[PDB]
Design a protein around this nucleic acid. Sequence first.
RNA 1: UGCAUCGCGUAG
RNA 2: CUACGCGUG
Lengths: 115, 814, 62
Amino acid sequence: EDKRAKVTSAMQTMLFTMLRKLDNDALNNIINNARDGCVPLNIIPLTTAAKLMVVIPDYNTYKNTCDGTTFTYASALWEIQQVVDADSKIVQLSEISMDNSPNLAWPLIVTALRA
Amino acid sequence: VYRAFDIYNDKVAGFAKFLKRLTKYTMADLVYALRHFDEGNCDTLKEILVTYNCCDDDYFNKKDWYDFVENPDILRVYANLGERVRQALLKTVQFCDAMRNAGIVGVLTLDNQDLNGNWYDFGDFIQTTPGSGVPVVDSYYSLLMPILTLTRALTAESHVDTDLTKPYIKWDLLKYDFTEERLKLFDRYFKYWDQTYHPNCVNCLDDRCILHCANFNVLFSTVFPPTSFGPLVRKIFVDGVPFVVSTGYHFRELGVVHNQDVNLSFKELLVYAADPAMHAASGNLLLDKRTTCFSVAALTNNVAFQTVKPGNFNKDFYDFAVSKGFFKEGSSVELKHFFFAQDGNAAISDYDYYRYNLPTMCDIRQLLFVVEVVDKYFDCYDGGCINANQVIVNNLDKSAGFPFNKWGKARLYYDSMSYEDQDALFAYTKRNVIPTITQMNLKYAISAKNRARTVAGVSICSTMTNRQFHQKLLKSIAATRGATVVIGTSKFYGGWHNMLKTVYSDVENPHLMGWDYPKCDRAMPNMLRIMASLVLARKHTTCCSLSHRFYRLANECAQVLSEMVMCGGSLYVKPGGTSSGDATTAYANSVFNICQAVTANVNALLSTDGNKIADKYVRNLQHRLYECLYRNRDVDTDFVNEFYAYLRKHFSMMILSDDAVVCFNSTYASQGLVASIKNFKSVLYYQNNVFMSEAKCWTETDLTKGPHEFCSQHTMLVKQGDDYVYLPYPDPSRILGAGCFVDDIVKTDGTLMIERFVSLAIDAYPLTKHPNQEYADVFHLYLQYIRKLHDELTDNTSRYWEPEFYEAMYTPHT
Amino acid sequence: SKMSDVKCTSVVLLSVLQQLRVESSSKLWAQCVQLHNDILLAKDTTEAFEKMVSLLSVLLSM
RNA sequence: UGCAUCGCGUAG
RNA sequence: CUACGCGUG
Ligand SMILES: [Zn+2]
Ligand SMILES: [Zn+2]
């Protein structure tokens, strides 16, 4: 009863918080473009996410995917904003290199913003 | 020499090898080689591969080249043949057209089409009215279906103009309805398949129609983009606020499904929170190059890496064992079981093993006959739907899943929702599909392998509703003794002996057999999981309608088969397989095991020459089996019963989820009338897409010795009160490791340790009757340690260090 | 016998290293876990002793 | 920090 | 029988 009310309040708060985290400038575009109004869930983060997080296992994948300060993924251009390591330390772009790769705590989590 | 032939006539029938411009090998040769695969005899497959430039002979010099797990590159080699297969299929249609125009009625056989696609058979063709010719293509397409998925024959359909050289087709990301594309593919490839095909399984007549349509959808979905599948979502306005909510689901097997109670309370709050729509919408995009699986989004600002801690060491017990003479140099009993720590990349790596789940099309006629036969193994049990008041939950302090774990345990949600609310949720699940998220959690357990173990904690709603759906049948199976499925049958108080006597029942030349399913959960096809769910739901004939049962199947497929998996704060799409935390984990696995066994038997019988069989009864049985498989659509109940009796007589089985013991007639197996280990290997190859190594399978010639291994316990025949009994003794290393190494430190020592050592002694007592003396001394060591623990802690406790208490547990009184 | 005691020493050593917050650093933890797992699966005593010496060196350095 | 099954121990 | 704790796929 009381705990039931607590659970209801918590779920409502979480949903409205995710709504605050939600933006409609991008969403309403796809909603109106869609004849049905129904869209696959997977495409929502692809075409509406402001931030992209890329997990890199090794240096070869880094070079193959997003080597430069700006890269292209999901038919969109992203600019790198941060490159943390497995220890959540701010690795700098210069440190990433075939020479210094053994001294970097792979995997590398790169966070970029949509251009 | 010997060539594969598909034959049907009054005298003989079946698909087997016979001694009987054009290419050297036919399509029947390829189908036989890929469906009857034996590593020792692959010459035909090797020659077909090298002749048509799928691989070079050097490829064969490598060992484990055939195994998918060790050498996944074989998938590429086979794929190099796919186009040929496709261009054979497209030629077949043309031939059929010609015949229809020529008023010719005949049966099309695989052994009459060369690997170039040309049809050179003009026999059995009887002229009729022009335009009235009708070909029989059941056997051809049915036998060729398994090869289509392995060779990835329809890959050309993923390219512009159906040409591999040209670029890929760019489908609109927002598109999700491929009904017209499926109809076009069916009319282009399977045009003369007279059975009606439904792209959306919501419009299926019965469970068999669902299986057929899903068998075709498995093949057709590979062509379509990978982002169309999954929860269909829509923006709606509730309380003057915009919520993105799920209003449907696109299934690689079941097509598009739309919720019937879509509109724009604790129940609605749970359905909202469980839905991955909100989480994926509020999550940042994620690209994960550590896996080959699809990545949805990241619900966390930072990635999470979880580690497995090292197991604790109990110094007192190990020192006691050393002082009492155990763990010496060269002793047979040694510590081979420990807690293996893991790095931060462990969890995700385990998830990456789902890479071994491949799209698998099944021989639909074979699967239909096999499900009909398998339903016989579940007739005794009773099933149906129950209400909330009749549901039993063993532990209410477990995890509720994501995002429910954030606020409380399962007890919280079971207490908050009244029985009426749970019944309302169940009824909603009978009309609408609720997609859910399952967390992947690494397990802390003892083992003899460095590999880590991951389990899937499903959300609270899935457990609640699947329980209300299946618990009656599940408890019925757990309360039945003397059946093929031995869930609920204890090994104590003579249970082992009773079970073993049940399995040995009336086999003329009894031999014993056992096997292992390589990567069962990860590599299990989705079609077989759907078939298991349908067999488990066939007990709802009276309480559920067709639509209700289909929507329950859709819920199961969207909450287990192809769910969304949170691994370290990041959502991923599961390619398929079976979850380990669903309500029907063990029983669905038992259904799958029985299905594989019946399939092996059916393949063994048909693969026999038939003319050689000197028994009229088995020859007629083979003929009628071919008839009921590739010539009769409607189920023949009498022959299903006869085949079930045949298998029970010559192929007695004992099944726990993945472990199986079999007592079979050795003479029939030698003559090919019943399945052998090679047949199981071939079936696991062409169906389960895994190679079974003969090392992990065992065959026992002497019934007296008993099963080599079942449920990780061995069998010993020992004399108790003038009567011999089969008793289960465990590997001593496991018990000693459980005694020495503990997961946490609270249990390392104290009064609680006495209970653990009493239980380990209960498990170890059967070792006292082993001829090896050390195995017996293990139990006395445990007893002495229990006594010493009581002494250090310091009448009743006497029974714990006196062996009569443990001897009683293995006697048939109770 | 020396092999079983080497295995148990490796177990307790990795437990101490875990309680030393070595898992905070990813690569050190990876090295220690690999060494310990190989020790537990080692069938020859000399290689197990070498890996145990390496783990003890890891502990001693800090 | 999953779904089951079986067996123990202590209390009502 | 109920609650709690401990010990195969
Ligand atoms: Zn249908
Ligand atoms: Zn029902």
